[PDB]
Design a protein around this ligand. Structure first.
Ligand SMILES: O=P(O)(O)O[C@H]1[C@@H](OP(=O)(O)O)[C@@H](OP(=O)(O)O)[C@@H](OP(=O)(O)O)[C@@H](OP(=O)(O)O)[C@H]1OP(=O)(O)O
Ligand SMILES: [Mg+2]
Ligand SMILES: [Mg+2]
Ligand SMILES: [Mg+2]
Ligand SMILES: [Mg+2]
Ligand SMILES: [Mg+2]
Ligand SMILES: [Mg+2]
Ligand SMILES: [Zn+2]
Ligand SMILES: [Zn+2]
Ligand SMILES: [Zn+2]
Lengths: 267, 100, 295, 81
RNA sequence: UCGGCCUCCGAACGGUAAGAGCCUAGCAUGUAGAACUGGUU
RNA sequence: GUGCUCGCUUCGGCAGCACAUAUACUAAAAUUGGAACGAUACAGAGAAGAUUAGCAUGGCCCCUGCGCAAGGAUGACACGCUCGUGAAGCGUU
């Protein structure tokens, strides 16, 4: 099914439409992202942290261990912060073109340098390492372009800006990374507003939780086999004593010690 | 609880179509008319059918012991199964392999 | 670890006649899980509407389970049958019901009553309505009959109180002086109004109802002969005999049009007391209203 | 199957990551006409309320009467057995 | 008069306890409600 | 408001017809109650000598985390149940 998202947004009363110059739109997106990352920080009451403008998270003062434990952020927040940093770089390059500080050749060269050195200008890779593959592809593309560019009288200067291939690579990455970041930030907002479920969904039995859990299950099985073996009457079940006897019998099996309780019922 | 907006990563939709049994994959309309009894006897019968000067000595004459490897024959003794994990044949082979 | 209050999502809100307005055609808005309940703090289906022309856009405040529990309006927090505060109705009928105040106990009790109602027919204000069969003791005397629309009046403009309402006549809020802040009638906790504890409107109406002796009588020195005025020649001794036949045996029933008084006396003291209490400015026979006094 | 498919569709539509009616009101205290209009849900809008409020578990269904065979009282020799 | 083959690449937790409550921040709500005096032995 | 009248008839307007028919959590506020956990102070790190790795288990205890992962001091918190005295019922004297 198609399910166009923007038509569903435009059908409501909370969305409007206009026509706009692209540089103003990029400035609006960067300002909106910075403003709401500050709103998330102030929602979590982390007034001792500070976002930059270029999306650099830094503490104001030295942190206590409670502030260090509470101020830790996951991969979703840091990945969105790095993505907004990359768009801030691209939009600021177009802004400095539009003020006339740099030339259009310099703007194309800056776009090529950004799309070839995402891994050197951003800390993007630390929160999702698979992008190294994309980074590797960008590096390979640069080599291809450079060794079709620096061919005749042109040399090893920085004047080559042919930014279409890296732009293609990062938009195909953005296509793939849109629903994952949408689900992650939706889960982050739902935990921020609905609160964290304490027990909630049951924990799986992972590797570090195998052995003790097996003992727990073993204990439960023995308890069931106590409660239907004992006949009618007998108020003193004494199942804890039977579990202690089972633990002692297993410990005597481990040490090759002959285990024999002198008076003990046969079943 | 269906009021939450937290979506688990393993709660995404996957394997949305149920595979059904085909005609050769024992659909119940061909199970219901069959007689499993007789087919079980020719399968059991097929399994039972397919189940079946100076003179010297000899050079090795001057030793102390002879025919010491006489009754050494494993054969079917490796086919024995014991439900004791310290007296199993696999555990004995394990202990003679991994301890020198 | 798997117990929580369920969210109450239902249509058809339970409102008074006064808060609903006067127009037969009302345009109505519904949010599925818009706000929380003002008492039991659960999310609930929030209904909002304008009751009339210059009203306030009143909306529902408490959830449907609390309003079905106490048989009150979802906005006015007054009784559906009589338009009274629930403290006055609890003083009239029964005050031993109560409710917990701590939030965990309140949520647990509300979940238990919600499960009881959902296991019931669906629309019944528990056994308290079974304790509400006895009525018209004194609550019908001070109950309103006309729809009091002045509580749907819009709020007071706070900019006009400081004299800075730049909208002027465009401002939908009221450009009039507020009530006295020193008056103890202006406190009005919502939880106090729901729980029926120290509400000043309820205390003022209880003091007003206590000063109206509509069932006192007993102005004779052990004499059952009481005079009901206002009868005249319109009400005869047959209506007095039919009124006294419900009390049992009547010693004497007569009507005099010279003083316009009906003399009623019973052989029993309790029957004469019931006949004097029923005819003390609450009995109308043959188009004539009777007020019982000494004769 | 129809009821369970309705329940499955309701559960999936509750778990899926994202007309005006006319009714007649009888107040029983004449009749009114009410135009049921649902307000538009803002898609740009987080959940409103904390839902992690744990309360202790409520009372169960009222208990069933307990049929049994009459109880065989154990002897004292059975008690030290 | 006879060959080309070129992996890697970094971040978090894992250490600088925990509890406590007094004034303090930030943040939620923009609320429901104001009923008042009259009859003859 | 716009457009037109077998109009009234001035040339301005009136009258009629046709179209156009119900916004707003209505605030630029007054209010109201909840609080990060930082300063000081109280405070003081599991396992019978000491220094310590940990996995659990229960739920009106939570925090970080996208978590059916992993951390938070092992996250914290989570011990004392074989004889006489009387009473009731049953059978014998
Ligand atoms: O990493 P950079 O500093 O940005 O240098 C890269 C590139 O480096 P990589 O191959 O590691 O991707 C080469 O530089 P070298 O590795 O050879 O030192 C290349 O140089 P050549 O193609 O000449 O071999 C070119 O440098 P240049 O502009 O001089 O051609 C280019 O530099 P830029 O990306 O800055 O353009
Ligand atoms: Mg120790
Ligand atoms: Mg560990
Ligand atoms: Mg742990
Ligand atoms: Mg540790
Ligand atoms: Mg340790
Ligand atoms: Mg633990
Ligand atoms: Zn009402
Ligand atoms: Zn409620
Ligand atoms: Zn005003």
């Amino acid at each position: 099914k198609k399910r166009y998202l923007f038509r569903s947004f435009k059908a409501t009363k909370f969305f409007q439409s206009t026509k706009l110059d692209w540089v103003e739109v990029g400035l609006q997106v960067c300002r909106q992202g910075y403003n709401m990352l500050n709103l998330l920080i102030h929602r979590k009451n982390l007034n001792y942290l500070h976002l930059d403008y270029n999306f650099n998270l830094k503490p104001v003062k030295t942190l206590t261990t409670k502030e260090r434990k509470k101020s830790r952020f996951g991969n979703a927040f840091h990945l969105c912060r790095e993505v907004l940093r990359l768009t801030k770089l691209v939009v600021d390059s177009h802004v400095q073109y539009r003020l006339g500080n740099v030339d259009a050749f310099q703007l194309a060269d800056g776009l090529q340098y950004i799309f070839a050195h995402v891994g050197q200008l951003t800390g993007m890779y630390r929160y999702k390492y698979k992008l190294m593959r994309q980074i590797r592809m960008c590096k390979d593309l640069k080599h291809l372009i450079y060794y079709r560019f620096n061919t005749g009288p042109v040399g090893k200067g920085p004047g080559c800006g042919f930014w279409a291939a890296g732009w293609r690579v990062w938009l195909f990455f953005m296509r793939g990374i849109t629903p994952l970041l949408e689900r992650w930030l939706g889960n982050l907002l739902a935990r921020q507003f609905e609160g964290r479920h304490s027990k909630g969904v049951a924990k799986t039995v992972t590797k570090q939780r195998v052995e003790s859990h097996f003992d727990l299950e073993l204990r439960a099985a023995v308890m069931h086999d106590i409660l239907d073996m004992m006949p009618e009457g007998i108020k003193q079940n004494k199942a804890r004593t039977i579990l202690q006897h089972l633990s002692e019998a297993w410990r005597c099996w481990k040490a090759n010690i002959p285990w024999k309780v002198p008076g003990l019922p046969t079943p | 609880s269906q009021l939450s907006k937290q979506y688990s990563s393993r709660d995404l939709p996957s394997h949305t179509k149920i595979k059904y049994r085909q005609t050769t994959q024992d659909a119940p309309e061909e199970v219901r008319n069959r007689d499993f009894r007789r087919e079980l006897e020719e399968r059991e019968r097929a399994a039972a059918r397919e189940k079946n000067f100076k003179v010297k000595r000899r050079w090795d004459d001057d030793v102390v012991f002879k025919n010491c490897a006489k009754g050494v024959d494993d054969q079917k003794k490796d086919k024995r199964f014991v439900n004791d994990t310290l007296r199993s044949e696999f555990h004995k082979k394990f202990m003679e392999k991994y301890i020198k | 670890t798997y117990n929580r209050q369920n969210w109450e999502d239902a249509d058809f809100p339970i409102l008074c006649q006064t808060c609903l307005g006067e127009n037969p055609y009302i345009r109505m808005t519904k949010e599925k899980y818009g706000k929380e309940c003002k008492i039991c703090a659960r999310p609930f289906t929030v209904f909002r509407w304008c009751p009339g022309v210059r009203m306030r856009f009143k909306k529902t405040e408490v959830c449907q389970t609390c309003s079905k529990l106490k048989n009150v309006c979802q906005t006015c927090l007054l009784d559906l049958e009589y338009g009274l505060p629930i403290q006055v109705r609890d003083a009239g009928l029964s005050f031993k019901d109560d409710m917990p105040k701590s939030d965990v106990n309140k949520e647990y009790y509300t979940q238990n009553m919600e499960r009881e109602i959902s296991n019931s027919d669906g629309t019944r204000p528990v056994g308290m309505l079974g304790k509400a069969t006895s009525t018209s003791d004194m609550l019908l005397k001070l109950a309103r009959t006309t729809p009091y629309y002045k509580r749907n009046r819009p709020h007071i403009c706070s900019f006009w109180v400081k004299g800075e309402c730049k909208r002027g006549e465009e401002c939908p809020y009221r450009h009039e002086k507020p009530t006295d802040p020193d008056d103890p009638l202006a406190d009005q906790n919502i939880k106090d109004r729901y729980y029926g504890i120290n509400d000043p409107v309820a205390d003022k109406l209880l003091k007003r109802a206590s000063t109206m002796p509509r069932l006192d009588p007993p102005e004779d020195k052990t004499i059952t002969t009481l005079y009901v005025g206002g009868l005249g020649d319109t009400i005869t001794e047959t209506d007095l005999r039919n009124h006294f036949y419900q009390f049992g045996e009547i010693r004497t029933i007569t009507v005099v049009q010279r003083q316009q008084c009906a003399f009623i006396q019973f052989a029993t003291r309790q029957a004469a007391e019931v006949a004097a209490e029923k005819s003390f400015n609450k009995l109308i026979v043959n188009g004539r209203r009777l007020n019982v006094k000494w004769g | 199957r129809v009821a369970l498919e309705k329940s499955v569709s309701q559960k999936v539509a509750a778990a899926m990551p994202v007309p005006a009616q006319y009714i007649r009101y009888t107040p029983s205290q004449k009749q009114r006409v009410i135009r049921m209009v649902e307000m538009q849900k803002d898609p740009m809008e987080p959940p409103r309320f904390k839902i992690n409020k744990k309360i202790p578990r409520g009372p169960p269904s009222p208990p069933a009467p307990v049929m049994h065979s009459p109880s065989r009282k154990m002897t004292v020799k059975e008690q030290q057995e």
